[PDB]
Amino acid sequence: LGVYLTKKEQKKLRRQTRREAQKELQEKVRLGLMPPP
RNA sequence: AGCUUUGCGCAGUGGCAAUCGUAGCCAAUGAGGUCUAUCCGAGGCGCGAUUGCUAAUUGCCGCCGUGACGACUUGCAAUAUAGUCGGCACUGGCAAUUUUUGACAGUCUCGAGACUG
Numbered sequence: 001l002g003v004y005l006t007k008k009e010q011k012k013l014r015r016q017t018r019r020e021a022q023k024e025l026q027e028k029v030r031l032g033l034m035p036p037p
Numbered sequence: 038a039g040c041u042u043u044g045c046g047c048a049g050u051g052g053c054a055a056u057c058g059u060a061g062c063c064a065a066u067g068a069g070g071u072c073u074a075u076c077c078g079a080g081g082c083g084c085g086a087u088u089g090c091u092a093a094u095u096g097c098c099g100c101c102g103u104g105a106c107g108a109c110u111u112g113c114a115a116u117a118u119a120g121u122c123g124g125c126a127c128u129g130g131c132a133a134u135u136u137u138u139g140a141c142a143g144u145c146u147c148g149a150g151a152c153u154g
Contacts (some may be wrong), residue, residue, distance in 0.1 A: 007080085008058080011057070012059095015057080015058080
């Protein structure tokens with residue numbers, strides 16, 4: 001059994017997926033975990 | 038035991054300039070139709086931000102000459118140099134052949150010599 005989802009549920013998922021990742025990386029450079037880009 | 042094809046997720050590489058989102062609405066109970074209408078087939082409207090940055094940037098080393106102190110070598114004007122060494126004083130002097138602060142271009146001949154701008 002499978003659910004599909006619409007265009008607007010792709011954006012929201014793609015953006016809220018991307019946002020969490022980049023901001024988490026942002027702190028890593030602040031905290032000095034990661035050499036600064 | 039390899040190969041192919043579809044969807045999603047995570048990355049690297051190339052190109053394009055309108056994208057993205059909606060606690061708002063309408064929409065297979067049919068959104069939208071200039072074309073063929075007993076036809077087509079899925080988003081449209083309204084609103085707001087391409088979204089964060091990076092590049093940052095600007096208003097103390099030599100000689101000679103003179104004076105004199107001390108010391109040594111010898112006769113002392115009661116009186117200081119007869120000669121040598123040590124150092125101080127002088128907006129003193131110093132730079133066109135011999136040797137450490139000054140000359141280049143090329144040819145030929147037997148380290149040297151001759152010539153050619």
